[PDB]
């Protein structure tokens, strides 16, 4: 549960970093920057927003490599250590 908290905070900080970057460099609204960061790191990739600048493209490359591991790490812990036990508890009437 300390592992979950840590992954939770790391995920938030990572996404705040993306939000700051894309709003600054690609000129997105903060909400759009946050959304883009999430859709990128979860690898959903809508692409409706996609970096138009080389700085944006280079950062996105680095961001994916460093960020995917921590985002999926958090999702995996969320699924196995949080959602799994919760659904199980519901199954005992």
Q: Which residues of this protein are in contact with a second copy, per CB under 8 A?
A: 6, 10, 31-32, 34-35, 38-40, 42-48, 50-51, 54, 57-58, 60-61, 64-66, 68-70, 73, 75-76, 78-80, 83, 87, 91
CB of 92 to K ion, least distance (A): 35
Task: Please check whether residue 87 is in contact with residue 14, taking contact to mean a CB–CB distance below 8 angstroms.
Answer: no
CB of 36 to a second copy, least distance (A): 9
CB of 24 to a second copy, least distance (A): 19
Task: Please check whether residue 21 is in contact with residue 59, taking contact to mean a CB–CB distance below 8 angstroms.
Answer: yes
**Residues 6+ away with beta carbon under 8 Å from 15:** 34, 37, 38, 41
> Out of a second copy, K ion, none, which partner does residue 42 contact, by CB within 5 to 8 A per kind?
a second copy
């Amino acid at each position: 549960d300390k592992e979950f908290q840590v992954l939770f905070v790391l995920t938030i900080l990572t996404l705040i970093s993306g939000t700051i970057f894309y709003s600054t460099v690609e000129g997105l609204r903060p909400i759009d920057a946050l959304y883009f960061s999430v859709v990128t790191l979860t690898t959903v990739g809508y692409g409706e927003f996609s970096p138009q600048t080389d700085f944006g493209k280079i950062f996105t490359i680095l961001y994916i490599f460093i960020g995917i591991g921590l985002v999926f790490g958090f999702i995996h812990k969320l699924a196995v250590n949080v959602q799994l036990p919760s659904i199980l508890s519901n199954l005992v009437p």
